[PDB]
Symmetry: C4
Amino acid sequence: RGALLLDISGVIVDKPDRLQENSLFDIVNTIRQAKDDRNITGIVMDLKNFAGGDQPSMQYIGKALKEFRDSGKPVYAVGENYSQGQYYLASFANKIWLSPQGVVDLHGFATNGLYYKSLLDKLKVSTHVFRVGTYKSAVEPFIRDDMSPAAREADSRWIGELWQNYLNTVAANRQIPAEQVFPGAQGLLEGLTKTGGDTAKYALENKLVDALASSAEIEKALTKEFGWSKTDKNYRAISYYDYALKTPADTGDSIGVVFANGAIMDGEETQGNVGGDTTAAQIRDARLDPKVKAIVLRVNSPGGSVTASEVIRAELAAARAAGKPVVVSMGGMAASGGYWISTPANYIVANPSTLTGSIGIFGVITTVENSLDSIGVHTDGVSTSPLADVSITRALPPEAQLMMQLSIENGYKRFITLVADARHSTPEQIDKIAQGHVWTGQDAKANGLVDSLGDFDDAVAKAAELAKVKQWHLEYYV
Amino acid sequence: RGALLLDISGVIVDKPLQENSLFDIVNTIRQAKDDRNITGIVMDLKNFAGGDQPSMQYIGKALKEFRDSGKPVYAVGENYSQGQYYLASFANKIWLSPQGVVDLHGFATNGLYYKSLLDKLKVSTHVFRVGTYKSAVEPFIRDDMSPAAREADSRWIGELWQNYLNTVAANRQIPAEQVFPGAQGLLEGLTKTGGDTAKYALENKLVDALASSAEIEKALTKEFGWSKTDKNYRAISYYDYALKTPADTGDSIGVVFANGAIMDGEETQGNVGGDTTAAQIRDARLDPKVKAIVLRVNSPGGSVTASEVIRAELAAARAAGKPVVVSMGGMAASGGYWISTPANYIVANPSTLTGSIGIFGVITTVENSLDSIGVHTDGVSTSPLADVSITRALPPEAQLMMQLSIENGYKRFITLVADARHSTPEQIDKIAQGHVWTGQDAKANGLVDSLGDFDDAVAKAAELAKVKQWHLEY
Amino acid sequence: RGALLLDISGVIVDKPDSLQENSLFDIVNTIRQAKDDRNITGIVMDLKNFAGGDQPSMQYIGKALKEFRDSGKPVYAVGENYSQGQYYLASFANKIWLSPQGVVDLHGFATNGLYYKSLLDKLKVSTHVFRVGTYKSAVEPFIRDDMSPAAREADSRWIGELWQNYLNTVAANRQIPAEQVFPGAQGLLEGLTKTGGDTAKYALENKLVDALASSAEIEKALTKEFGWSKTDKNYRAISYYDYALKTPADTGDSIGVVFANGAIMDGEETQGNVGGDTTAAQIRDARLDPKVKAIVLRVNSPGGSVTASEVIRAELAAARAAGKPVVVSMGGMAASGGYWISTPANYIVANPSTLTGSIGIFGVITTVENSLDSIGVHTDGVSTSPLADVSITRALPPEAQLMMQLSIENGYKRFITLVADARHSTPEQIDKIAQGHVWTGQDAKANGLVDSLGDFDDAVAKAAELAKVKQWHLEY
Amino acid sequence: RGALLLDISGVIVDKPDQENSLFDIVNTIRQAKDDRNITGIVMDLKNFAGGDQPSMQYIGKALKEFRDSGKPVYAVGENYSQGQYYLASFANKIWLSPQGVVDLHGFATNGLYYKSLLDKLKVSTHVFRVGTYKSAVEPFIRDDMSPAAREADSRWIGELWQNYLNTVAANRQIPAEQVFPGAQGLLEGLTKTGGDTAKYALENKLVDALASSAEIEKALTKEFGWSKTDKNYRAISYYDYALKTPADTGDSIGVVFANGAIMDGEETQGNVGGDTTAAQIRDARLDPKVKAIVLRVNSPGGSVTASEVIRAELAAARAAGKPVVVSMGGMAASGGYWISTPANYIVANPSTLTGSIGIFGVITTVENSLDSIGVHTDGVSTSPLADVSITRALPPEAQLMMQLSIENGYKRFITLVADARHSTPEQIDKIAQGHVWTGQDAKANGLVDSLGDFDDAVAKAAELAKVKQWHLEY
């Protein structure tokens, strides 16, 4: 009998490439095993080396911890300090211990990017942006020295919300109002001034933390609830990394689980990206395995290559047409191309804090003929068509401009049409909520882009509801 | 049974996936024609990065032949680049994605020109040249292409694109200008289709059907049958399909490759080594089983001194009475042509780029560049001919000698070619002076004997001796 | 039966980071073994590939050398040349040989630091300093183009003392006045002009060295003393590197030795650095091992992370609270963070040449928003608080400034509070000897920061005395 | 069983750390001279990048011995570089291509001079030097050569080029001015000939016949015969012809190399280690079966403390009764001469570059360069002598000690040479002052005892010692 010690070191991810990358589902499933397991009597969270996860993922680990607590097992969180990310997770604890010289470091959210128009003018770089989408702002750095007013309003909307969800969640976890979790900068400074700059008393007096206590006082309290081990020389516990997650029994009705974790590129899966052909081959696999009864596509992608996306879409559409229901589970990001790949699904579930939509399209051509000219380098040559002088060192010909603008207008019509046919809508109605506008899962649910607010559990349960009643999971991490 | 799957990945080259052998491709297609077990060919070219035009036309021929035997050839893809499509266009039936494009845009050349940079940097440029159209020296002395260079390059690029269009025309049975109507024409045809590139391709018959990956799968499994084992239509990939190792008759024709720039040393990097190549020819010239030689050339040229070593072993072979046939495949220019000179017979593809009979040297020194940052040189010499280095002014004595050496090198080139192509030096001038020529223009002015491909050069070789043969490679 | 050959190559360090790095303790313990081993008849020091050690440390080897000597075995020093550091050790020898054309290179001590206020202004960099410590001088590079007067005064005091410590020790070893070991630059110029720029004659007439000889003569003289090995074709000797130090008998009753060597980092160890978690775990092992009766913390550290220092301290404090005495042994440096961790001990011993103190706290933030703006690069984005809006490419928001300044004021108060509670003093008393001021072990002892002046031997002896009996060392 | 083919590839060196040992070459020619399996030598030096004149002359000497036993030596090549042709000229017969060139052009010296740049960067330079002719220091202090340097350098380069001419003139039995007439003459001679470089070479007797590569292979078989196995003329490459390992007589002469710049530690790179060489000399001194020591030197010099370590060991081997003879090969200057002073006897090639008895040191600091970009250094020091970092000005006390140190170093140097050369510092001063001296100048002024080569060094060591000897190396 011991505690499960959650000494997560590193980041939380959907799928890999004291480890630096930790699987969200492996963490949750281990916690749930710990729940039913007679030999574990509690969890301790030691999050010093934990670097963070997206809000939808951390909320999921949280859900597993509430389920754990609701069984009547204690969950403790200990540390000298908490970053904003560690505290979010720690907030789901029964009880939070802080060092008497420690800080709870709550400071808000911020987005930040470089803008280079002025530098491009000075280098005499020639820039061409082809885009459809007033709010498709990844383009702005080449053509502004600042974010556009449209970009500003879309980005304020989402970030302001993701942060309210941070506060509402943590507030509820701690049972104090949101303004007390974080009162803003004026109030934090006022609070910190009473306590004479003591961050830990501010934390204790405002209920962010339950007790201040040294590392040895913590140990005494932990051995008292969990007992002492003569072999280990500590309180009785076993680390996440040594606790064995029992490999689940296989039924025969399986639900296939395919990851789209990362930027979507054209070929095989390289780096930490999605490869169109690798993912399409994993989908094909489940589509032809008679054992596999439904597919869940777990998406965490900003997007990427339009040809890559189409290839993946095609396959999911074939799976569903083969009579295997497709359910998308969105976890953090499923935007642009990552929304593109989700469209053929029977059902789309997103986390309220998920970032999605961004239904729009862009392309950027920079050329350097003038930059080279100014230092006396030129290019010259012969061609059979102006359509053939497209190169970084040559001016973009107007023929190639015309084709590029037509290509991009056509691709945008493609996108809103797919979504229009997928979402039981009209290309004209989709235009009203597209134009490159990024939406949180909450907004997307409100405007039709997503079907229900939830998590991977909800996606799986739904895929199972489109057929039968004892399932197990086939993953394609291979 | 099953299809042969031509899922070529990478480039085509004479002599090494990523590098694929032209000859293994052609011979596998030819073996698959006679193989009861192959019932057709599917081309999947998505990872195929191109080849030169002669080479792809060669692979075409083998596809036409496979086709002429009654077996089907199919092209499938989401999209086609201009390289992929040339090849695919040999297929009976071309399948495009309903959102795909066939991306035809023409041919273009492009190079850096630096006269002004070198002047700003205060570099001294020394040019030694014979050839108005030997234009590869222009970047050092111009900011743009010379009017002469522009005519020469427009000529051959013009021809090569026409060759592209005509072949693809003939392959699709539609007029050349419908294959590619020019920029305006392409714009007008895309407007009319709402910018649907695939509808454009289908209405102009670039392609035979629009269809999805799993629509193509089905249509392919109907034709080739379903494999319970692989869970796909019946097919073996070219990379897994064993090409049979041909029998040693006992009378052979040696094939030697001069693939790349020609270097003095031995076979380095992706280059031709004068001495490795000379030795491969020596091997063939003295093996009594070898009845003739085919020199398969694809080279921009390079080292004149290494050119001679190769040329001399070739002449030796011919002098001992072994016929030497050159098979040009893509490029055989300058020194690629220098080593080709002693052959009994010279064959180029019409799209081959050859000639460029001319000579040049460039010296850049940096004395003034250093001087302006306060770095100088000094020393003693026993002759100004000794004072020759990147950091010092080029001595006028050194200039006179280098000029003389280049004038002489030029005379050597045209004399070699005059002797070898049954002309006079003065006549070879009128068509040398650095000018690049396509196989067609070369044939027309005597530099080349006939238009064809490797098949014809082999055939000519066996015919300059006698009648049953196998190939020996080195 | 040979000489012991101290042909040391590289530097001396408390703990080699698994020659180049030679262990202080292995050297000292091998000389002591060689004193009682009838197979070793003397020591020969060949230091041409010896790149230095800190002064407390070479003093400590010196002490082993004096002990070897006092037992009646000779110590000889040999070189074509002596660098300033090589000569310190050499000077403990009975007799020093120098090449007839060689030099004893004594020149003094010097500090040297870069200062780039003017650069940062030309480069349009924004600088933000959060400091408490008038002599907490490691900030001056960002805000000045030269030392502040306060910084000069403090650095002059310690550098002066350490160079005097060097002269006084070397003088004593050679039995000549300290001004004759080194007369100043003017005196050296004088002694050398009188000699025609001949450094060996200077050295020999001023008694820095005992005799002048080529390698092939010294050889002769040394085989006279040690006898000739026919097998090795050389005088009878064995190198330090081949001569086995014996692993001491095991008692049961141990004193544990934990190293705090280098910059103090938050992680675990990996580098040439101290890792908070790694050092705490070592201290824990020793704390819970009933075998271990006392702990010695061997410190040589410029400092580093406050939070990692706290981790180390808390384990030390717990060790002491559980009844195991903790004795600090300060080596070359034990300053700032390296003093923080020393604070919980029953007893602090430093070498008089140790640099310690430096009780203060600092913070520097540079941002590059104006540097980017001048080349047409800009940042922009959205935030829910200015507190979130902190990174190298943005202006430091006024709200963040106020928070960092509170933080620094509070960190200084932590520090002096800790020190005042540990050295039976008041916070207001420690301020008068804090303010970031660096002090020698001697100035440290005189102001209460340190309990006694001595070396490693004195720290061990004290640890044993705070418990009892006969001991031996568990290293970690 | 055929020609020894010297298809030397790379460079000649004293000791290989591409690199061919000078002695392995000489000792293989001498073995082949007396081996009845070798009927001749063929020199194929297309891949030979050169060696110093003294070394090539040494190989030439063994070629002459080889030729005098009546076995022929042939030189074959498409071209001859200046280095290559020096060697080829020791052949009975020299064959050139009819397109070939003999590239004779003289000698040059050239160096960078940095003063202007150093002042532009505001660098502070402190030069400490004794020796009007110690010119290695001139790039730190000026834009160009001082008249002193250009006199010293014209002198030795002139002499080395004339030795080149004289040797090659003797080898070809034509007068020197015919070998290379100067720029004017070469250009005229190449004009009475249409720019034909081979015809220039044949008419002026640089070369014996112009001949195709196959015309050479025909005359080379016939003389050496044909091998049906190798399918060439009978022949074995230098690299495959085993040099037999000489016996252990009973009395040895130690050969110790000092090849390259002299550094302070152990041997690294292509440099001399003061302590490494010393241990070698020391093993020599103590191994009772070594009766003499030869120090083979090819060094521009380097570190004085490392030179002294070496000198002292050698002086000790001599005092211990073992004679020391120096063989200079190419360079033995500065420290390379310091280390040579203990010897009973010094032999230099007339083309050896030695002397340079002189001393210098440079300190550069960057306080003003850093000042101008707004970086400064500050700190506390207990003496001005402790402020000696590159970012600090050099303090006046340190300048004075440095000058006094260099003054004393030069005194030590002319003093060592005075003792060793039976002279006085006053007499040595007249021939010191940093002045570089060829072998011949050094023999005339008394810095060297005789002109000769490794063989003479060895013979002289055996004479001072006695009897029948083999060589022991390290």
